[PDB]
Amino acid sequence: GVEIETISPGDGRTFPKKGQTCVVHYTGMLQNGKKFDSSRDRNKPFKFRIGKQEVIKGFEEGAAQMSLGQRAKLTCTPDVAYGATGHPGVIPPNATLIFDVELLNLE
């Protein structure tokens, strides 16, 4: 389940397509919680490609639904990232993950 909440600036037209190494200023967030991951912290905005299931389904589906420049806001469900599994110490099981996603991509 990917619900997109776009902060309006962007272009609306340049979608990431298959195998395209696209660049995201993501800034993760726990629901009723603090941050857990941020490409703004590492300052390398995570040049990942579409269609290899590198990222979760809550963020891979969110990337194609966004275009260049767009600043959406994800709400990833439990069953797309870590609901059944849960990461030890970081993201528990049954977790509804939150993201500040801005798509200033390449390719």
Numbering used by the authors: 1 to 107
Sentences from the paper on this structure:
RyRs are calcium-activated calcium channels critical to excitation/contraction coupling in heart and skeletal muscle. Ca2+, ATP, and caffeine are well-characterized activators of RyR, synergistically activating the channel by inducing a rotation of its activation core and pore opening. We use cryo-EM single-particle snapshots of ryanodine receptor type 1 (RyR1) to exemplify the discovery process facilitated, and the new insights revealed by our approach. Broadly speaking, conformational changes along CC1 involve the cytoplasmic shell, the activation core, and the pore; those along CC2 involve only the cytoplasmic shell.
In qualitative agreement with the experimentally estimated association probabilities, the binding interactions become favorable from state 3 (“S3”) onward, becoming most probable at the FINISH conformation. In the absence of an associating Ca2+, the energy of a transition from S1 → S6 increases, corroborating the experimentally determined trend in Fig. 1a. Notably, the energetically uphill motions of opening the Ca2+-binding pocket in the –ligand state cannot be captured by brute-force targeted MD simulations, when only the START and FINISH conformations are provided. Information from at least six structures along the functional route on the energy landscapes was needed to identify a thermally accessible pathway by MD-based piecewise free-energy simulations (see “Methods”).
